Design a protein around this ligand. Structure first.
Ligand SMILES: [Mg+2]
Ligand SMILES: [Mg+2]
Ligand SMILES: [Mg+2]
Ligand SMILES: [Mg+2]
Ligand SMILES: [Mg+2]
Ligand SMILES: [Mg+2]
Ligand SMILES: [Mg+2]
Ligand SMILES: [Mg+2]
Ligand SMILES: [Mg+2]
Ligand SMILES: [Mg+2]
Ligand SMILES: [Mg+2]
Ligand SMILES: [Zn+2]
Lengths: 136, 135, 38, 176, 94, 134
RNA sequence: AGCCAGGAUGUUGGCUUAGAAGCAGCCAUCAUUUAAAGAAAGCGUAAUAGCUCACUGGUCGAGUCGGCCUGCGCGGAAGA
RNA sequence: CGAUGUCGGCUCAUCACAUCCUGGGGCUGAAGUAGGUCCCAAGGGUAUGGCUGUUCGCCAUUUAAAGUGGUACGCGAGCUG
């Protein structure tokens, strides 16, 4: 389950998730799973997907995760009123804009990559597409 | 699937054997197991007979190049060819006994001298002995 | 009968059909394979 | 479309009468009458029947196809005639015909008596065999289904009224 | 030999470029050498099916700008963030 | 009609041939002595295949076939049992002269036309049991 | 697409097991007759048999197949 | 906040259906009997007691069943306390 080893600060301001993705091309493998949606991918979601696609390829070939959940998410528990400080960090997300190549793969035939990526896409909160390595 | 490159090659391989062989035998082979066929393949190679099943459309193309251009009307239904490259006859006798002993099929038509032979007059190339008989 | 949102073909003898606007999976080889979208 | 384009060849001894959408086909085996869907345009001419879509009607060909198919089995109906055969499987299962009524002994407290509709005639070559005969394919199909419905083939022994050509897949009972 | 048909653009900028794409066309530039750069519009469906073949990005292509023929080479392509579409192409005079 | 593989000079025990052929309707003493009377010329310690042809009157007729391809490769290489994982584990070695010896005997049952065609049909039986051609 | 026909040989491949003979598993997956037939995609047998597919010849006679960019719909949809 | 009485019981109810029983049906690892699961269905029906303020729960013994919820956690200008 991905997470930053150390951080300059504990808690982060909410922020916003406007704009288009940076890192839209299959830069390491032959195939990719690209984001069509806009949302947040959690550390658990990333692992869930990673596991599905790995199990599929029978741990042949190579996988890359182009996303890292470096955003801390706070939460207030039950029977706790508003204010009295910012909640405690519970989980981590990666902000996802449409276009982000989430996962990359090579060392497997196209048919298997597609199937692997189909299985991992079911564990994801945002819409995805299959992308192939392109000349420029 | 048969590509046209494959189709032309099947046309060529049978067009070549056509020129060389003397007696060619055309027949039906529907409703006969491979056990009886692999057996008629052994009896063929022994007698110097070439055995093949080729698309009736593809046969009308490898026969057009003469002298079997009268076997056109025999390319309707399952077609099996028996090209005798070594000694005229062989097949015309090998098919007659295989037809009676197995009861399946009827044997379409025979060809020799660049002339058509009907289904009733196949007794002509069936009564011919050896080469190898004139001595 | 299996009533679910995702009605798919399960074997080669599975056939998708539309009867009165309801997507159905009618199968000849496996009765377990019979589905209705709902 | 592929069905509708293929014409129905009306033979000798078969009279065809067309009154707009209503078609009457009279033969040796009987008389049948069908009212065709307004999207269908039927033409007579020679010893054949041709079908096609009427201008403006959307589902034209789909309707024209059905029409052809119906009228073909109508032409067949009034000449050759249709035949459905049913065989009774199981102990004590018997059947007999007394005119237009099929008496069926099917393991119930009361014997089942099935009345036959117009044009359908049945006979019993055996005590375990019902042979249906008529001109309407849709009606002979219907009667066969109704008789089969009294005791559909059971999956543990094949017991019940089954069509002659019906394949009955059996299975083993729960283990332990 | 890839033959691309093109027209010189009567407009430039955001508003004008977005309009081209909405009309199943896309902007593209031709530059290189002593000559001034040429701003051109391209049919989207035609150029897309072409760039699908790897020879597009290697070979010398000919561009037909109002009767004239310009020999080029694909230099840089801008793709749609998630759809199989083209946003802009940098062509370089060869 | 059933297919079996009984030994050159052994035909009678209950576990291999006993209720396997006897269940159809074949005489257990009539076949067991008529088979060993014709397979007396076949060498000791060589399993020989036999096919049974039975009719409605419980009568039988058998035609003897040449020893199997996976059987003759064991005595030629000097092995009793084959490899558990073929082409992953090597159990023996057979020369090109031994390949043609198994092929000249199997000529009565083989589909091949030439000697090279019958040799390659034994080459495949050797690779699929762990034995390497040397 | 439908329908007719075949779907073989070595061979019951080897190992394992009371048996494993395409069809519990494990490993290999060639070669022959070939129009074509996987050392076998599923059902079946105690194991065999038996049924069918992948593939291919015949018949028929003109279209057929499924991805892409997109418009409008359909199911997903239970409350006092 | 110049007052909208709080839990439970009693009496009297009324609606929803995410159905406990009865009814119809599909699949079953459904032989039969009897189950499991899902679909359709709200017409009617749907325990008395021991303990505790209890609702609930545990228990005894029934019943075809002893449903789940909404109604100011229904109901004090109706009762209880
Ligand atoms: Mg209905
Ligand atoms: Mg603007
Ligand atoms: Mg076809
Ligand atoms: Mg007041
Ligand atoms: Mg309901
Ligand atoms: Mg469930
Ligand atoms: Mg009620
Ligand atoms: Mg008391
Ligand atoms: Mg109870
Ligand atoms: Mg209250
Ligand atoms: Mg009071
Ligand atoms: Zn199915």
């Amino acid at each position: 389950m991905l997470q930053p080893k150390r951080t300059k600060f504990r808690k982060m301001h909410k922020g916003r998730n406007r704009g288009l993705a940076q890192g839209t091309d299959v830069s390491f493998g032959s195939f990719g799973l690209k984001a069509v949606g806009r949302g947040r991918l959690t550390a658990r979601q990333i692992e869930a997907a990673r596991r599905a696609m790995t199990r599929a390829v029978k741990r042949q070939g190579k996988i890359w995760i182009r996303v890292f959940p470096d955003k801390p998410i706070t939460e207030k528990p039950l029977a706790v009123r508003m204010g009295k400080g910012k909640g405690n960090v519970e989980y981590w997300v990666a902000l996802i804009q449409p276009g982000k190549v989430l996962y990359e793969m090579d060392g497997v035939p196209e048919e298997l990559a597609r199937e692997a990526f189909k299985l991992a896409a079911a564990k994801l909160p945002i819409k995805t597409t299959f992308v192939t390595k392109t000349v420029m | 699937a048969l590509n046209l490159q494959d189709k032309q090659a099947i046309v060529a391989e049978v067009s070549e054997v056509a020129k060389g062989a003397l007696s060619a035998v055309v027949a039906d082979s529907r409703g006969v197991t491979v056990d009886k066929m692999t057996e008629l393949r052994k009896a063929g190679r022994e007698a110097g007979v070439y055995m093949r099943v080729v698309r009736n459309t593809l046969l009308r193309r490898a026969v057009e190049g003469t002298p079997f251009e009268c076997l056109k009307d025999a390319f309707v239904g399952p077609t099996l060819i028996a090209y005798v490259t070594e000694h005229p006859g062989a097949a015309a006798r090998l098919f007659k006994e295989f037809a009676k002993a197995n009861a399946k099929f009827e044997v379409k038509a025979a060809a020799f001298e660049g002339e058509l032979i009907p289904a009733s007059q196949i007794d002509r190339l069936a009564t011919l002995p050896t080469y190898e008989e004139a001595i | 009968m299996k009533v679910r949102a995702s009605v798919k073909k399960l074997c080669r003898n599975c056939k998708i059909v539309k009867r009165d606007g309801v997507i159905r999976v009618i199968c000849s080889a496996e009765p377990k394979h019979k589905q209705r979208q709902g | 479309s592929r069905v509708a384009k293929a014409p129905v060849v009306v033979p000798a001894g078969v009279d065809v009468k067309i009154n707009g959408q209503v078609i009457t086909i009279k033969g040796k085996n009987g008389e049948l009458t069908r009212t065709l869907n307004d999207a269908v345009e039927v033409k007579h001419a020679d010893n054949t029947l041709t079908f096609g879509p009427r201008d403006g009607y959307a589902d034209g060909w789909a309707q024209a196809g059905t029409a052809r198919a119906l009228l073909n089995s109508m032409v067949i109906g009034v000449t050759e005639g249709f035949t459905k055969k049913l065989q009774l499987v199981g102990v004590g299962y018997r059947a007999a015909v007394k005119g237009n009524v099929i008496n069926l002994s099917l393991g119930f407290s009361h014997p089942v008596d099935h009345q036959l509709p117009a044009g359908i005639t049945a006979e019993c070559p055996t005590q375990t065999e019902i042979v249906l005969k008529g001109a309407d394919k849709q009606v002979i199909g219907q009667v066969a289904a109704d008789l089969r419905a009294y005791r559909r083939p059971e999956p543990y022994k094949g017991k019940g009224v089954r069509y002659a050509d019906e394949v009955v897949r059996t299975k083993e009972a729960k283990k332990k | 030999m890839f033959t691309i048909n093109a027209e010189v653009r009567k407009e430039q900028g955001k508003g004008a470029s977005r309009r081209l794409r909405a009309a199943n066309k896309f902007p593209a530039i031709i530059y290189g050498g002593k000559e001034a750069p040429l701003a051109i519009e391209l049919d989207h469906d035609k150029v897309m099916n072409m760039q699908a073949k790897a020879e597009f990005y290697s070979e010398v292509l000919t561009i037909v700008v109002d009767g004239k023929e310009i020999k080029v080479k694909a230099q840089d392509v801008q793709r749609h963030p998630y759809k199989p579409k083209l946003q802009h192409i940098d062509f370089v005079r060869a | 009609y059933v297919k079996l593989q009984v030994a050159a000079g052994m035909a009678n025990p209950s576990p291999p041939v006993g209720p396997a052929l006897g269940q159809q309707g074949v005489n257990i003493m009539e076949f067991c002595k008529a088979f060993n009377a014709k397979t007396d010329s076949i060498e000791k310690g060589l399993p020989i295949p036999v096919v049974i042809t039975v009719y409605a009157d419980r009568s039988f007729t058998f035609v003897t076939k040449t020893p199997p391809a996976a059987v003759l490769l064991k005595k030629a290489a000097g092995i009793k049992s084959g490899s558990g994982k073929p082409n992953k584990d090597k159990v023996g070695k057979i020369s090109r002269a031994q390949l043609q010896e198994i092929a000249q005997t199997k000529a009565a049952d083989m589909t091949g036309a030439d000697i090279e065609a019958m040799t390659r049909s034994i080459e495949g039986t050797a690779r699929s049991m762990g034995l390497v051609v040397e």
